[PDB]
């Protein structure tokens, strides 16, 4: 599954609902701490509509537990990320991923 650890609290009241667009900043890393992707480096927030499976399952389920303004560390198991096949060249097979995610706003 996905484990959500708070780094900084959000408002503790506004939680993403299916169909809303989540605007976040994130940094993805492999178990060893090696960064593989980051919207922060591109200085451009990432957007995705909750429930449309435009992102890995661990995000859909983990971000739904965050409130607006919150920054959290999500630890995601392979089955909730890229599985046995992974994404050759970037994500190895059976990789557990760690994401530092900040929920900026909802649209
Ligand atoms: N995959």
From Swiss-Prot:
Interacts with TGFBR1; prevents TGFBR1 phosphorylation by TGFBR2 and stabilizes it in the inactive conformation. Interacts with ACVR1B and SMAD7. Identified in a complex composed of RYR1, PDE4D, PKA, FKBP1A and protein phosphatase 1 (PP1). Interacts directly with RYR2 and RYR3. Interacts with GLMN; rapamycin and FK506 abolish the interaction with GLMN in a dose dependent manner. Interacts directly with RYR1. Its EC number is 5.2.1.8. It is found in: Cytoplasm, Cytosol; Sarcoplasmic reticulum membrane. It catalyses: [protein]-peptidylproline (omega=180) = [protein]-peptidylproline (omega=0). It is an enzyme of class 5 (isomerase). The modification N6-succinyllysine is found at residue 52. PANTHER family: PEPTIDYL-PROLYL CIS-TRANS ISOMERASE, PEPTIDYL-PROLYL CIS-TRANS ISOMERASE FKBP1A-RELATED. It is a peripheral membrane protein. Belongs to the FKBP-type PPIase family. FKBP1 subfamily. Coiled coil: none annotated. InterPro entries: FKBP-type_PPIase, PPIase_dom_sf, PPIase_FKBP_dom. Inhibited by both FK506 and rapamycin. Keywords: Acetylation, Cytoplasm, Isomerase, Membrane, Rotamase, Sarcoplasmic reticulum. It comes from Homo sapiens. One of its GO terms (biological process) is positive regulation of canonical NF-kappaB signal transduction. This is Peptidyl-prolyl cis-trans isomerase FKBP1A. GO terms for molecular function: activin receptor binding; calcium channel regulator activity; FK506 binding; I-SMAD binding; macrolide binding; peptidyl-prolyl cis-trans isomerase activity; signaling receptor inhibitor activity; transforming growth factor beta receptor binding. One of its GO terms (cellular component) is cytosol. Residues 19-107 form the PPIase FKBP-type domain. The modification N6-acetyllysine is found at residue 52. The keyword Isomerase applies. Keeps in an inactive conformation TGFBR1, the TGF-beta type I serine/threonine kinase receptor, preventing TGF-beta receptor activation in absence of ligand. Recruits SMAD7 to ACVR1B which prevents the association of SMAD2 and SMAD3 with the activin receptor complex, thereby blocking the activin signal. May modulate the RYR1 calcium channel activity. PPIases accelerate the folding of proteins. It catalyzes the cis-trans isomerization of proline imidic peptide bonds in oligopeptides.
